[PDB]
């Protein structure tokens, strides 16, 4: 019953094993984010504690990426806005980025896909 327990509800489970959800804020057109394309994006990541972005806003799918960023983007189209829960697996895991980012968390994200090439 944490807040991001409960906007887990009903969120699409893009991984399968319910580390990488999905919400659609609002809808892009056409092809989905080719597998190793240069998107072009504004992002925002959340920790549960915080009342501030943890971290906020091109990219090629070679960076050392977050794990659920790349599964998010490629689940993205053109002018999508989504907001997606990464579990620990698809994030920071059991390290986390101390002191920032605690063992364990479940972090936000909210990415906005404004175009790729």
């Not at 936000?108 to 896909?113: G, H, N, R, V």
Request: aromatic share 10%; charged share 25%; hydrophobic share 40%.
């Amino acid at each position: 019953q944490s807040l991001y327990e409960r906007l887990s509800q009903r969120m699409l489970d893009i991984s399968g094993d319910r580390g990488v959800l999905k919400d659609v804020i609002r809808e892009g057109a056409g092809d989905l984010v080719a597998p190793d394309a240069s998107v072009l994006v504004k992002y925002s990541g959340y920790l549960e504690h915080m009342d501030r972005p943890f971290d906020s806003n091109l990219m090629k799918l070679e960076d050392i990426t977050l794990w659920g960023m790349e599964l998010g983007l490629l689940s993205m189209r053109r002018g999508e806005l989504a907001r997606f829960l990464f579990k620990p697996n698809y994030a920071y895991g059991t390290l986390g980025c101390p002191p920032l980012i605690p063992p364990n968390t479940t972090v936000l994200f909210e990415i906005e896909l404004l175009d790729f090439l």
